[PDB]
Design an enzyme around this catalytic site. Structure first.
Site, PDB file in Angstrom:
ATOM      1  N   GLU A 225       0.829  -1.199   0.000  1.00  0.00           N
ATOM      2  CA  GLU A 225       0.000   0.000   0.000  1.00  0.00           C
ATOM      3  C   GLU A 225       0.888   1.284   0.000  1.00  0.00           C
ATOM      4  O   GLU A 225       0.609   2.290  -0.685  1.00  0.00           O
ATOM      5  CB  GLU A 225      -0.846   0.028   1.248  1.00  0.00           C
ATOM      6  CG  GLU A 225      -1.996  -1.057   1.220  1.00  0.00           C
ATOM      7  CD  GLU A 225      -3.088  -0.722   0.190  1.00  0.00           C
ATOM      8  OE1 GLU A 225      -3.003   0.355  -0.455  1.00  0.00           O
ATOM      9  OE2 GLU A 225      -3.985  -1.571  -0.008  1.00  0.00           O
TER      10      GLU A 225
ATOM     11  N   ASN B  68      -7.724   8.955  -5.264  1.00  0.00           N
ATOM     12  CA  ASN B  68      -8.544   7.964  -5.927  1.00  0.00           C
ATOM     13  C   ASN B  68      -9.390   8.693  -7.022  1.00  0.00           C
ATOM     14  O   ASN B  68      -9.671   9.904  -6.930  1.00  0.00           O
ATOM     15  CB  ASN B  68      -9.495   7.304  -4.921  1.00  0.00           C
ATOM     16  CG  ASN B  68      -8.757   6.572  -3.789  1.00  0.00           C
ATOM     17  OD1 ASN B  68      -7.828   5.768  -4.024  1.00  0.00           O
ATOM     18  ND2 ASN B  68      -9.153   6.828  -2.567  1.00  0.00           N
TER      19      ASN B  68
ATOM     20  N   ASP C  67     -12.484   8.759  -7.503  1.00  0.00           N
ATOM     21  CA  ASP C  67     -13.702   9.376  -7.015  1.00  0.00           C
ATOM     22  C   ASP C  67     -13.454  10.691  -6.297  1.00  0.00           C
ATOM     23  O   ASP C  67     -14.437  11.323  -5.827  1.00  0.00           O
ATOM     24  CB  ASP C  67     -14.516   8.408  -6.120  1.00  0.00           C
ATOM     25  CG  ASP C  67     -13.845   8.097  -4.729  1.00  0.00           C
ATOM     26  OD1 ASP C  67     -12.731   8.566  -4.445  1.00  0.00           O
ATOM     27  OD2 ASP C  67     -14.464   7.409  -3.919  1.00  0.00           O
TER      28      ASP C  67
ATOM     29  N   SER D 275     -11.585  10.990  -3.484  1.00  0.00           N
ATOM     30  CA  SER D 275     -11.198  10.709  -2.103  1.00  0.00           C
ATOM     31  C   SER D 275      -9.650  10.504  -2.241  1.00  0.00           C
ATOM     32  O   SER D 275      -9.140  10.449  -3.368  1.00  0.00           O
ATOM     33  CB  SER D 275     -11.848   9.434  -1.561  1.00  0.00           C
ATOM     34  OG  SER D 275     -11.530   8.262  -2.278  1.00  0.00           O
TER      35      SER D 275
ATOM     36  N   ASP E 201      -6.167   8.387  -0.238  1.00  0.00           N
ATOM     37  CA  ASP E 201      -5.719   7.345   0.713  1.00  0.00           C
ATOM     38  C   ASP E 201      -4.444   7.916   1.403  1.00  0.00           C
ATOM     39  O   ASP E 201      -3.542   8.494   0.746  1.00  0.00           O
ATOM     40  CB  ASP E 201      -5.273   6.110  -0.031  1.00  0.00           C
ATOM     41  CG  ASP E 201      -6.435   5.285  -0.530  1.00  0.00           C
ATOM     42  OD1 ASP E 201      -7.594   5.626  -0.202  1.00  0.00           O
ATOM     43  OD2 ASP E 201      -6.141   4.267  -1.235  1.00  0.00           O
TER      44      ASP E 201
ATOM     45  N   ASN F  54      -8.662   5.542   3.414  1.00  0.00           N
ATOM     46  CA  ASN F  54      -9.362   6.408   2.510  1.00  0.00           C
ATOM     47  C   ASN F  54     -10.249   7.436   3.231  1.00  0.00           C
ATOM     48  O   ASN F  54     -10.914   7.116   4.218  1.00  0.00           O
ATOM     49  CB  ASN F  54     -10.138   5.425   1.570  1.00  0.00           C
ATOM     50  CG  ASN F  54     -10.811   6.069   0.374  1.00  0.00           C
ATOM     51  OD1 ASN F  54     -10.886   7.281   0.236  1.00  0.00           O
ATOM     52  ND2 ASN F  54     -11.340   5.199  -0.541  1.00  0.00           N
TER      53      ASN F  54
END
Ligand SMILES: [Cl-]
Ligand SMILES: [Cl-]
Ligand code: NA
Length: 129
Positions: free
Chosen positions: A35, A46, A48, A50, A52, A59
């Protein structure tokens, strides 16, 4: 902070993630590796909108507040910036709530695609724990 593999495994253990919800330590280290490459400052946007944050790329759509993810929640009750600290306390505490949500570690797509079913023990091989 970029943790060393065994350094991170030891901090994760200390904070109670070893076997948390049944997931052995190596699963958490493997997830962190893919990650964030063990970097507490890692961030990735991301599609959308959002973002992380942190070693476990938590997120802003559901878990932390960053002030810029419309209609999102802050279920861990923390500013997303706390997830970028050299102190992994906030990330771990939040990870515990995510993994307890019904889907276990499948919530981390990289864990499902690159760690699940593999020999995750290798990630803590050689560490003094
Ligand atoms: Cl927001
Ligand atoms: Cl599970
Ligand atoms: Na949010």
């Amino acid at each position: 902070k970029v943790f060393g593999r065994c350094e991170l495994a030891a901090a994760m253990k200390r904070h109670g993630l070893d076997n948390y919800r049944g997931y052995s330590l190596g699963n958490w280290v493997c997830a962190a590796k893919f990650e964030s490459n063990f970097n507490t400052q890692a961030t990735n946007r991301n599609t959308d909108g959002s973002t992380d944050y942190g070693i476990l790329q938590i997120n802003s759509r559901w878990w932390c507040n960053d002030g810029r993810t419309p209609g999102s929640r802050n279920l861990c009750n923390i500013p997303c910036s706390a997830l970028l600290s050299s102190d992994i306390t906030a990330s771990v505490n939040c990870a515990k709530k995510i993994v307890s949500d019904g889907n276990g570690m499948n919530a981390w797509v990289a864990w499902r695609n690159r760690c699940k079913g593999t020999d995750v023990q290798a990630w803590i091989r050689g560490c003094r724990l």
